[PDB]
Structures are given as structure tokens and as C-alpha cells.
């Protein structure tokens, strides 16, 4: 898994809205 090479931050944490 890539995980955006510690740069994007998981799409900015789902742009402050993502239930997981």
C-alpha cells in the first residue's frame, strides 16, 4: 500500500469527513 509517501495525509483525512 502506497499511503501517498507521507505527503498528502490520506487525502487530508478525507477533507475532515470519513467514517472508518
- Is residue 7 within 8 A of residue 1, CB to CB? The reply is no
- Is residue 3 within 8 A of residue 10, CB to CB? The reply is yes
Q: State residue 2 phi and psi, 5-degree precision.
A: -75, -50
C-alpha grid cell, residue 15: 477533507
Planar angle of CA 4, 15, 3, nearest 5 degrees: 15
Planar angle of CA 18, 3, 9, nearest 5 degrees: 55
Rounded Cα distance between 1 and 13, Å, is: 16
What is residue 3's three-state secondary structure? helix
The answer for 13, left when phi > 0, alpha when psi is -120 to 50, beta otherwise, is left
Amino acid at each position: 500500500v502506497i499511503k501517498h509517501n507521507r505527503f498528502l495525509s490520506e487525502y487530508q483525512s478525507n477533507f475532515l469527513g470519513g467514517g472508518y
